[PDB]
Design a protein around this ligand. Structure first.
Ligand SMILES: Cc1cn([C@@H]2O[C@H](COP(=O)(O)O)[C@@H](O)[C@H]2O)c(=O)[nH]c1=O
Ligand SMILES: Cc1cn([C@@H]2O[C@H](COP(=O)(O)O)[C@@H](O)[C@H]2O)c(=O)[nH]c1=O
Lengths: 257, 257
């Protein structure tokens, strides 16, 4: 029983953040997350504004913005609200709960104040999620757990991936899904977001491996494609994003019937 | 069979950063790394100045500083040079090489400009090291790989730990050791730093587990203890740091003979 994004948004155990995401994916016909790996706030905001209508999510690495300020993130929130997409900071929290709680709430980035979604590696055990969730629950935030990775030599396989799935299931009041290369949970309440995506076959020179939208959404059963250089390196980033959106969207439609 | 810190600093394959660290550990009779998990730059610099004589290393989480600026790291360097300790930013790089390279050099933190040491998780595969190396080698830096973690439910065990050791030994131009709970490499050129250390048994309420300096250095074979709250929460932080220094140092001496 493969359900549309809109119906999954109505599932009994759905987290509010995931429901909001799934509703806008259905409304806008996009399951594309732009990975805005840029070093200038001006470029980040110009990309968010021009590509907002094409994306369900904008993934940030605020630690590579040379001119980060909280005012930049306020402007980004305004665009996310205007164009209707979630903001996902790819922070990869990956330490004991006492530390990650401080990294999520505090410091100069104050990630919890502007990020709808964050992610975490599961290697430290569930305390990483327990620490994050203390901050995220009053703020109605959600978290994605990295169950699989797209890079060569990834150790996020086998029992490690199963441990991520179990951890997500155990913390479903905060964890809304996974970073993975394929469907890893059979529960339709969880989102699957897949990086390592490009239209053409290949990789990079530092261990990144790419698969196509049709492969990851259609055959591997993921929900959302995360695309950075496949868009950001094009001259016309809008046309590139539209190519990726149509690819991922039609791949999703094909598995409904 | 076991070599003093001073003799390890002279080994043919020793990395310069490890050598520099080992030499100052011997000179100052300290194998204590202070974990300065604080929210204010003022507190970071006051602790570095007051406790610098007692430590071989100061471990930072710059992303928890509410008022981070590069001028704070310039002042920290001056203290590190004066008191002779290394600066270890506990960044936990943990993604594909192309991303971590930018995170290490760029953004607001400019970590490579001031951190003698950083660490990385090995879950992405060796690309995480290859990316960091492109920034750290020109800047004469070292990196620690997280082979084991101190937290309940850690997945950094078994084959994962072995994969970390192999990764380190194959990138010895840049990787100088590990975050681990024990000796994980038999090569004396590599340093073992162990967090989760307190004098008394216990843990915290978010999955941290503690072992004593004598257990970690003496029976488990590690080189350096990383201590945060055990010192920072003490009324007399200098006396606490001295207690941890003497404990770890004597356990190291005992192991030698
Ligand atoms: C957890 C995870 C994250 N990213 C992130 O996804 C984006 C992929 O970008 P690109 O499409 O340019 O390779 C980058 O921001 C990267 O750090 C991956 O590529 N793979 C992963 O397994
Ligand atoms: C990789 C790793 C890091 N830290 C860090 O070591 C310090 C431990 O501090 P405390 O002594 O306050 O528990 C913290 O900064 C924490 O994030 C651990 O505790 N355990 C780990 O496995």
């Amino acid at each position: 029983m493969e359900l549309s994004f809109g119906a999954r948004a109505e599932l009994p155990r759905i987290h509010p953040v995931a429901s909001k995401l799934l509703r806008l994916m259905q409304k806008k016909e996009t399951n594309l997350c732009l990975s805005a790996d840029v070093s200038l706030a001006r470029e980040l905001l110009q990309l968010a504004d021009a590509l907002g209508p094409s994306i369900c999510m904008l993934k940030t690495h605020v630690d590579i913005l040379n001119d980060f300020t909280l005012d930049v993130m306020k402007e980004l929130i305004t665009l996310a609200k205007c164009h209707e997409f979630l903001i996902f900071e790819d922070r990869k929290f990956a330490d004991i709960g006492n530390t990650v709680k401080k990294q999520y709430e505090g410091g100069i980035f104050k990630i919890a104040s502007w990020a709808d979604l964050v992610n975490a590696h599961v290697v430290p055990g569930s305390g990483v999620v327990k620490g994050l969730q203390e901050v995220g629950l009053p703020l109605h935030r959600g978290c994605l757990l990295i169950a699989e990775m797209s890079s060569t030599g990834s150790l996020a396989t086998g029992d490690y991936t199963r441990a991520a799935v179990r951890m997500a299931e155990e913390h479903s009041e905060f964890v809304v899904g996974f970073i993975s290369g394929s469907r890893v949970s059979m529960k339709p309440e969880f989102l699957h977001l897949t990086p390592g995506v490009q239209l053409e076959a290949g990789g990079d020179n530092l261990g990144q491996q790419y698969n196509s939208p049709q492969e990851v959404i259609g055959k591997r059963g993921s929900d959302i494609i995360i695309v950075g250089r496949g868009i950001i390196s094009a001259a016309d980033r809008l046309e590139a994003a539209e190519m990726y959106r149509k690819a991922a969207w039609e791949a999703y439609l094909s598995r409904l019937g």
